[PDB]
Symmetry: C2
Subunit: 67 residues, 2 copies
């Protein structure tokens, strides 16, 4: 799946306009990038953590769902 | 930063209600998790790709921004 398909799937599931999903997705990605640029960690419970080269550490729950 | 702080930062930047940002963020995480559970790749231009254990490969743009 690419970014466009991700936006369409999320807009359908949440009952949201694609333009609002794109704004919020882009703002999420910009916020995570800015945090990593300052050396901060972005820890999302039930998914994983982004830290700094950028690295992603999957959470227990994600690993179990993908296992 | 944790998930709550991420939601608050994105809601301020996008001028969106925190409940709407949480709904869209959770739906994005659920959508990525479901794709990975089916063995699909989630490739987001200008950020990176999630693929399958779950792995994240940072994009060129993200690597340049955090170097």
């Amino acid at each position: 799946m690419n970014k466009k398909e991700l936006i369409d799937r999320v807009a359908k599931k949440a009952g949201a306009k694609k333009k609002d999903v794109k704004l919020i997705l882009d703002t999420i990605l910009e916020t995570i990038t800015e945090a990593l640029a300052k050396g901060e960690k972005v820890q999302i419970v039930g998914f994983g953590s982004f830290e700094v080269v950028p690295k992603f550490k999957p959470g227990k729950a994600l690993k179990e769902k993908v296992k």
